Amino acid sequence: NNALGLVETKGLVGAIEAADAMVASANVQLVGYEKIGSGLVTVMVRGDVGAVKAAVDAGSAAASVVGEVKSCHVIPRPHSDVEAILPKSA
Amino acid sequence: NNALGLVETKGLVGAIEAADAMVASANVQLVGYEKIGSGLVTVMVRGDVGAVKAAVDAGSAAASVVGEVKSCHVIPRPHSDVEAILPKSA
Amino acid sequence: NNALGLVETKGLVGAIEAADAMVASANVQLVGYEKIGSGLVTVMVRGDVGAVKAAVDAGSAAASVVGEVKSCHVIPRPHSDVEAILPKSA
Amino acid sequence: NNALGLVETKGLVGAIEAADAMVASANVQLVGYEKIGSGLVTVMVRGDVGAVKAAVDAGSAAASVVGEVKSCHVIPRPHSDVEAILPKSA
Amino acid sequence: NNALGLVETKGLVGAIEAADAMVASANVQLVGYEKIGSGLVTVMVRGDVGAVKAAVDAGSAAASVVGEVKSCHVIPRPHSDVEAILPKSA
Amino acid sequence: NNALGLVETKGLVGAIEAADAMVASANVQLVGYEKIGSGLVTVMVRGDVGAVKAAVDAGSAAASVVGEVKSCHVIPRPHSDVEAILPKSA
Numbered sequence A, B, C, D, E, F: 001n002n003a004l005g006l007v008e009t010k011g012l013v014g015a016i017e018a019a020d021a022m023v024a025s026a027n028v029q030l031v032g033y034e035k036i037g038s039g040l041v042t043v044m045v046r047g048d049v050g051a052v053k054a055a056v057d058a059g060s061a062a063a064s065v066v067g068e069v070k071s072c073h074v075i076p077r078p079h080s081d082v083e084a085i086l087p088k089s090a
Helices: A012-025 A049-066 A080-084 B012-025 B049-066 B080-084 C012-025 C049-066 C080-084 D012-025 D049-066 D080-084 E012-025 E049-066 E080-084 F012-025 F049-066 F080-084
Strands: A003-010 A029-037 A040-047 A068-075 B003-010 B029-037 B040-047 B068-075 C003-010 C029-037 C040-047 C068-075 D003-010 D029-037 D040-047 D068-075 E003-010 E029-037 E040-047 E068-075 F003-010 F029-037 F040-047 F068-075
Touching: A003 A012, A003 A049, A003 B012, A012 A029, A012 A040, A012 A049, A012 A068, A012 F003, A012 F040, A012 F068, A012 F080, A029 B029, A029 F029, A029 F080, A040 A049, A040 B012, A049 A068, A049 F068, A068 B012, A068 B049, A080 B012, A080 B029, B003 B012, B003 B049, B003 C012, B012 B029, B012 B040, B012 B049, B012 B068, B029 C029, B040 B049, B040 C012, B049 B068, B068 C012, B068 C049, B080 C012, B080 C029, C003 C012, C003 C049, C003 D012, C012 C029, C012 C040, C012 C049, C012 C068, C029 D029, C040 C049, C040 D012, C049 C068, C068 D012, C068 D049, C080 D012, C080 D029, D003 D012, D003 D049, D003 E012, D012 D029, D012 D040, D012 D049, D012 D068, D029 E029, D040 D049, D040 E012, D049 D068, D068 E012, D068 E049, D080 E012, D080 E029, E003 E012, E003 E049, E003 F012, E012 E029, E012 E040, E012 E049, E012 E068, E029 F029, E040 E049, E040 F012, E049 E068, E068 F012, E068 F049, E080 F012, E080 F029, F003 F012, F003 F049, F012 F029, F012 F040, F012 F049, F012 F068, F040 F049, F049 F068
Parallel strands: none
Antiparallel strands: A003 A040, A003 A068, A029 A040, B003 B040, B003 B068, B029 B040, C003 C040, C003 C068, C029 C040, D003 D040, D003 D068, D029 D040, E003 E040, E003 E068, E029 E040, F003 F040, F003 F068, F029 F040
């Protein structure tokens, strides 16, 4: 039940750049890569809280240079019930 | 035929944060997690009315900090006919 | 070939609230619950014209309190050819 | 290779009302009912040119009262090559 | 590796009218009819460059009268690598 | 683990023109052609960094003449973890 980091962008170029900067900046695993329409894509990572916080800061900053960031967030310990609604693979 | 709580967000980060805050704030079960396009996602919970009201208040407040809330509502006792149109799992 | 009532909302919370208020306010059956993108959802009911008119008035009013109503309408007797394009279940 | 009539609406309520008014106003057959996203729905009819012109005039007028009409048009004789891109059923 | 002509419209009525005017105005074959969301539809034709240029001019003009044209273009000789991303049928 | 070039357009005509100009301007392979809704399409190429940079410059310039460019970017060496979220074919 590790920390969860999320970066949502409008556009796929921003999502790919966020994903690359997140995995490169800290020891985190890509666990979600979700499209919900209206061009919105959410990149999700998991790891220890410090690594996830560093990853989301790097990802949002990198995606904002090339594209459009909608939201970014860290959940240090998602409730066990939340795992049902999280993606099962990136 | 328990109470139904709904939080609809524009963006997946807001939906995940609403879902986490709803299940953490009261004894409710996640029963819906629906995408309808235009980036709209609806998170649905069920439980006793007091727990559902507390969950929707927590979820809408949490989602509004990180994303965009479209609507939130509680139906204390959905009509039996309505169960046909509700999701069958989250 | 009974009367048809339609409530179209932008957002799922408005659609669920319309559906609940429609079935609770009159003796009508839920026959359609359709998503067409751009967050638009249409709730459809059937029954005798008086019941359908009461249902659509209740549904549009209820959905407007919690969400956004796009259109609402009653067709007292849809032409037989129209049944081809109507949903086959809610 | 009969005449083709088209009414495109933003919203399903407008599309259903166009379809009902088209089939009721003239001897035309419903041959298309297509969703392309952004809430756009196109209703298509076929028949003799006079019937199709009457149907499209009735459909666009009826849909404009309850919803939003995007476009309406009549093609008196679609080119044989065009039949490939037309729907195969309503 | 013949010339490629493209007409992209917002709305299906504009796409059908473009397709009909393109095939009627010159000796071209319909090779693509693609939906990408946000109501965008791209009609594609192939043939000799003069026929394709005449087709795209006719199609964009016809679609602009009834609907909304987003873009139109002619590629006289698409690179062999591009054939991978072109539709395999209209 | 070669360089990755991305051109995202609003509209398919811009995407096809970007893809053609990218493959024609440098020795790059088309590796992605992705639709995410809201009319957004991302064209992806791979190759040596100099070829990818030349391809993305040519593609964005060409797509901007005929359509709308949302973003363009080059990643000289995507992190190994990123390959999970990249398309598996164009």
